[PDB]
Structures are given as structure tokens and as C-alpha cells.
Design a binder for these strands. Structure first.
Length: 53
DNA sequence: TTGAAACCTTT
DNA sequence: AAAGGTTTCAA
């Protein structure tokens, strides 16, 4: 329902839709898991704020 | 305001 | 215990 930065949205699409794990999102995107956590947290809070149109 | 490990909580 | 979320830090 919302288009934000490209970084935020990628990981929410990845983990929620195909139930992509965090190590999965990482090892496949070749990026640290902590980073997956931060991208997911901020994709969420950005949806929250911009779910109120 | 990014990337990332530490650090709590949920499963 | 391991995955999932959060708070915090340095660049």
C-alpha cells in the first residue's frame, strides 16, 4: 500500500511475502542479518506513518 | 540518518 | 536455543 525508499521496502516484501528468513534475506542479498533487522524495522515504521493518507 | 552489533522478546 | 524485533553507535 506504500512506496517508500527502495531499501526499506525490499526487505518487507522479501520476509513477509515469501516468508524469507533473516539469514535468507541476508545470505541471498549478501548482507548482514543485523542490517536485515534494521531495514525491516524501518520499513515497518515508515509504513505505519504513511498508512495514514 | 544509515549500517550494524548488542540486546531483549517471541517462537 | 535460535529467530525475530528493538535500542543504540559510529560513520
Amino acid at each position: 500500500i506504500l512506496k517508500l525508499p527502495d531499501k526499506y521496502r525490499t526487505v518487507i516484501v522479501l520476509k513477509y511475502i515469501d516468508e524469507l528468513s533473516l539469514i535468507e534475506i541476508g545470505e541471498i542479498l549478501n548482507i548482514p542479518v543485523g542490517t536485515v533487522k534494521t531495514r525491516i524495522h524501518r520499513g515497518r515504521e515508515a509504513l505505519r506513518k504513511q498508512l495514514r493518507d
